[PDB]
Amino acid sequence: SCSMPLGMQNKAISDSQITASSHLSNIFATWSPSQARLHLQGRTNAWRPRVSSAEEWLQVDLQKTVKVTGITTQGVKSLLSSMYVKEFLVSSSQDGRRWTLFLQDGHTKVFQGNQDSSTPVVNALDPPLFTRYLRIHPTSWAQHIALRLEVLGCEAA
């Protein structure tokens, strides 16, 4: 049903394929883009931008055209409790330079994301994307932006 994980949880998507607008890093911690993997545990187990604004994004380069049918999101809990993205936008690209915002009924689609730190939330993409690159744009969050992600889809051919 073209809904299988594309490699965030299982590392078929390598660390170098995951980038972001910024990430939170200092002399203690590193919430790197490549930590944005569904169900990841261990230290600093999510992507966090350096500051939480509505201009941040997490990018995945799938390295080939894929039929992308869904996106799964999760937050994270740290010492300062629960952080999660409540709402987000999606954009996509074939070349990584020109980006197309995902729409519903001709208007920007706001996806409803998480309401806690650990439960995964699956969002279908209808119409599906035939694309190489994806960006997640947080627009509402609890405490701070933090994300663990899976991308769902299949090889079109």
What is the helix (H) or strand (E) element at residue 69, kind and residue range? strand 58-74
The rounded distance, in Å, linking the Cα atoms of 84 and 143 is 7
Report the C-alpha gap between 79 and 114 in whole angstroms: 19
Residue 106 to residue 113: CA distance in whole angstroms:
21
Resolution in angstroms comes to 1.3
Q: Is 123 exposed, middle or buried (0-12, 13-18, 19+ CB in 10 A)?
A: middle
Give domain limits for the chain. 4-154
CA distance 122 to 98: 26
May I ask the CATH architecture of the domain 4-154? Answer: Sandwich (2.60)
Nearest alpha-carbon partner for 138 in 114, 122, 103: 114
- Omega of the bond leading into 127 within 30 degrees of 0 (cis): yes
**Contact (Cβ atoms closer than 8 angstroms) between residue 119 and residue 140:** no
Experimental approach taken: X-ray
